[PDB]
Amino acid sequence: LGQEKERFQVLPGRDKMLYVAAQNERDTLWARQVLARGDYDKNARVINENEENKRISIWLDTYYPQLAYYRIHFDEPRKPVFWLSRQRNTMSKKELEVLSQKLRALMPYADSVNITLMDDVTAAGQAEAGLKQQALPYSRRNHKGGVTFVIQGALDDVEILRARQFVDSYYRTWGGRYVQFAIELK
Amino acid sequence: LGQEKERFQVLPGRDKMLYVAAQNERDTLWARQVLARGDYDKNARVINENEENKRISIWLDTYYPQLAYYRIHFDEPRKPVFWLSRQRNTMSKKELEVLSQKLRALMPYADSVNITLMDDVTAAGQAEAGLKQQALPYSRRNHKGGVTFVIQGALDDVEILRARQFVDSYYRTWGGRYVQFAIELK
Amino acid sequence: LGQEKERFQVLPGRDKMLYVAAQNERDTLWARQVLARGDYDKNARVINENEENKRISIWLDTYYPQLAYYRIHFDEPRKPVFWLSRQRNTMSKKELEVLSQKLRALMPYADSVNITLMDDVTAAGQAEAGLKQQALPYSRRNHKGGVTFVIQGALDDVEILRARQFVDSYYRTWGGRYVQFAIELK
């Protein structure tokens, strides 16, 4: 990979394909272009966290429709970590091993998929803390199966930016399936 | 290094790579350019305190998410010092040796990473003292898990500058994870 | 040194480097330029009191952070004198010999570094006397760990100049860590 060794990871697939793991969309596009140039399109794929999370969510929409979960993390791409709700889980260890097996089959570059339970109260508390940290007025509204944090009042361009970066960061960690943020409209 | 011996340090890595330690961003960019010219990009890396602190923080966000800490200092780059909260520490000596080991692995140029406990009350007091030194009006607001110092009133261009330099200096020493500064908006 | 024998001193270093001691910034710049011309940059350094005081202060900020001190004087550059607070000293003779040893190592051109205790009440009294000498109105404000002298009223261009020269002189002798001067704003 050369000077690109820090941006990308090449992983072997169970499907005999090669996977290039990228860190963002701009690297993903560029990497796909390089592939589409040397004609490796049929033999290699470029992956990223955001796309893979969307792709697996589609599959879950049809196979595990009532599933209470957060997000998959790929800090170690050969061993992704699937974050599930601790409070809202209904499945036994055996059923969770089945899910993990089916997730592995969907990600040919993954040795295994670890299912890890995450606390809902913690999920919402980390959202609150980040808003308190920036002395942002907000209302926490608890609904059935989620929480909305409504950010209130006017904010300057800097504060609008700093709040957007917090929100973006939160979603990258937790996904947008449980806690959501919104901006007050008056 | 020649006439550059005072700005940079060359350190060997456990990964067989060479590390050039720089003092600021402008030296870091220039040093990377020199490397990108002689084609040492694949064999040498340029490091600085600010970038390394951000890089390790990312890793801690996922592996030690509840960790109460300040900052890593590199006054001796082969032996960085990781400043942890004395009051908010929950880990035993053994758990702190584990952390230190994992920090070492992340910094191939470090012989060891020393974990040092720093007093929260001291952290906030040094922030206060620096504001008192400049006869700056401020409110200290104690929150849960932090302190905000809100600098009040109008200030002339010189005083705005001298307050920014204090704040910048404070953050370089302590990081921005516990004590924060803000400017009053009226 | 020739006609330059009165402006500069050449001192040998323990590090095998040669040190040129200069009296001001303009001589320091000029001396560095001469060196950067004959290619002695890698073998000789130019030093001055102001820069050396800043350089050692940085080191003390991290190694002796609570240290109550004034300034280092180089009237005899091979034997600098480090002025410490007599009232606010907490260290024993042994601890002060340790400090002196570490200061020596930081100044390869110094045979030894003498640590000398200076009286805080004397430090503030010399500030007062110099202001009384010029029939300057002022308020002495005693704070915790320092004194501010606030110079009051309007002054003509000559008096503004004479007060600036006193202040500049004071700081050169005592540093700016204990007594500070300020100008009243009305």
From Swiss-Prot, chains A, B, C:
It is found in: Cell membrane. Required for invasion of epithelial cells. This is Protein PrgH. It comes from Salmonella typhimurium (strain LT2 / SGSC1412 / ATCC 700720). The gene is prgH.
